[PDB]
């Protein structure tokens, strides 16, 4: 095996994988960003009631650490309603308002009638 290049580069050795003899923490920490903690309450303001009535949307005060993906997949769990799109914004109050726009056939005004806000 001749040295073709004048640069001795470090040879690559073998690298094993962690086979621990005991897990550090005993139990996996439960997911504290539950489908319920991710949606606190709705809004009943005529700035969102015109969205419900006209734009066929809903306005939730979601957790601030929530993605539009977690929101979509958690309204499709708490309310079983397919979602058109989600538009979030953090208020000066600090909470994250979220405008969820329902699929064409699903009626916001008629799922807010169900869940209580009307």
């Amino acid at each position: 095996k001749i040295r073709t290049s004048p640069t001795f580069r470090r040879p690559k050795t073998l690298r094993l994988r962690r086979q621990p003899k005991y897990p550090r923490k005993s139990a996996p920490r439960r997911n504290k960003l539950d489908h319920y903690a991710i949606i606190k309450f709705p809004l009943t303001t005529e700035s969102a009631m015109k969205k419900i009535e006209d734009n066929n949307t809903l306005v939730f005060i979601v957790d601030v650490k929530a993605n539009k993906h977690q929101i979509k997949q958690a309204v499709k769990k708490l309310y079983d309603i397919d979602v058109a799109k989600v538009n979030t914004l953090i208020r000066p109050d600090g909470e994250k308002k979220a405008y969820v726009r329902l699929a064409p056939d699903y009626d916001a005004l008629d799922v807010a009638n169900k869940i209580g806000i009307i």
């Binding site: 004048p6 640069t7 001795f8």
Partner: protein
């Protein structure tokens, strides 16, 4: 080749052991047992090895 430091170090310490005037007390370790006497020596020193574990 540009060798690593440890390689070049031991390779030029073997050279310092050829450049420096080595006193006879250390030089008396180069005149060593030959290759034919060594065999018979370890042949005799194999019948009297210590015991294992």
């Amino acid at each position: 080749v540009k060798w690593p430091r440890y390689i070049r170090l031991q390779r030029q310490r073997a050279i310092l052991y050829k450049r420096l005037k080595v006193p006879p007390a250390i030089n008396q370790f180069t005149q060593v047992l030959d290759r034919q006497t060594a065999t018979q020596l370890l042949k005799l020193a194999h019948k009297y090895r210590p015991e294992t574990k």
